[PDB]
């Protein structure tokens, strides 16, 4: 993993772009790894890192979500791509177009032989001005749901400690959609959208923390 934790290679922190679509039997996390994108947190981080690690692959499949009346590909100064602003490669920062952020209501059927892992997020602004500047509505909400599960997250506004310049945060969540099942995403603000899904696999794959060098 060199400079990258598994979760950072998952989200697509720019310095981790080399790990796109990689497979592993054992993923080695080094103590010198560092994050260098939007400051984020993962509720049950341990569980997300576990299930990805156990899956053994970062194989990603793009999908087109029917986003309507919002702008895509928002970037941040905390996550540069060279000299200009950037963002996590596998996530899609959505914001207002013109002066409205209409409600989003999209679907994605799993019609495939295998399970899909969707990674998505929710944006926590530092101020109400920031909240309304980006999403027009004063109070966002994100709802991601299958037929047998739902997660609705309310974004929380307020200051956190400066990290790479920002008081704001993104919270990462996940959703597994089984074959025959159907993903629906509902939001009127603060949605950090998935650009597709990760393949899920089962087998002997894991992850380990070590600074031992690798040998032939």
């Amino acid at each position: 993993g060199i400079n990258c934790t598994l979760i950072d290679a998952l989200l697509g922190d720019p310095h981790c772009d080399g790990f796109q679509n990689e497979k592993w039997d054992l993923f080695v996390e080094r103590s010198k790894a560092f994050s260098n994108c939007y400051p984020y947190d993962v509720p049950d981080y341990a569980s997300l890192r576990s299930l990805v690690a156990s899956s053994g692959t970062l194989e990603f499949i793009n999908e087109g979500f029917n986003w309507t009346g919002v702008t895509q590909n928002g970037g941040s100064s905390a996550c540069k791509r060279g000299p200009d602003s950037g963002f996590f490669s596998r996530l899609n920062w959505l914001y207002k177009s013109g002066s409205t952020y209409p409600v989003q209501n999209v679907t994605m059927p799993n019609n495939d032989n295998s399970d899909k892992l969707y990674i998505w997020g929710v944006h926590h602004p530092s101020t109400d001005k920031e909240q309304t500047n980006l999403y027009v509505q004063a109070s966002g909400k994100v709802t991601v749901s299958t037929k047998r599960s739902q997660q609705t997250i309310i974004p929380n506004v307020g200051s956190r400690p400066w990290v790479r310049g920002l008081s704001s945060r993104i919270s990462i969540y996940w959703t597994i959609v089984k074959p025959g099942d159907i993903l629906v995403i509902n939001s009127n603000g603060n949605l950090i959208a998935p650009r597709g899904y990760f393949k899920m696999r089962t087998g002997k794959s894991s992850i380990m923390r070590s600074d031992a060098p690798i040998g032939t």
Partner: antibody
Amino acid sequence: EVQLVESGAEVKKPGSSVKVSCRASGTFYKYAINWVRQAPGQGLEWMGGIIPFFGTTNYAQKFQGRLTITADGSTNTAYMQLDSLRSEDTAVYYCAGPSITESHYCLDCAAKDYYYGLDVWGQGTTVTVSS
Amino acid sequence: QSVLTQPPSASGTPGQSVTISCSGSRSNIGGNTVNWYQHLPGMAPKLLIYSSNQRSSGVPDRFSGSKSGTSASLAISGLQSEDDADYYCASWDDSLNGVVFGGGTKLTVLG
């Protein structure tokens, strides 16, 4: 693509206040809209700018307190208000902005990152300050 | 007394080249890109150069800008009669926290 049209020429008594409008012919909100004047016999003087998306203003310190730059997103219009008019404020007032587009926009950079070379100008509004 | 300093005039006959200089400081030019404008008064200014050295669209290649340290130059080679106008440099100034313009240079095409 976009064209800016400013409001009509005015005349004001000293002490009074003036508000000039700038109407874009298309969405023109993501980057810094600038106000720049020219008094008779002087070079161009930068008044200030707004970035409609965030509502963010930057003013030349010389005008702090009497200059207010404002924007309305639905009608694609920027406004410039100048109070306590002296005769030195007699000038042609231009509004101007850049034509850049970006597939990946930055939602949190510094104001200055949104200011670019001004290649779309309004025609200018003559404000004359007299009794 | 503009923050950026241009000479007030420049001249030449058709075909010559002229160099219009802009003298600033750390807080503006030495740390920011410079733009150049052209102005034939009563009618609105026009952008010629952005990013210190890029011709804006439709601007003839005889116009060129450059920057080094805390100054900037606009070079017009192969001068033409249409070029008789006012020229201004501008840039962001990090201490003023706004844009500053040069005092302008009046270019007169003679002959």
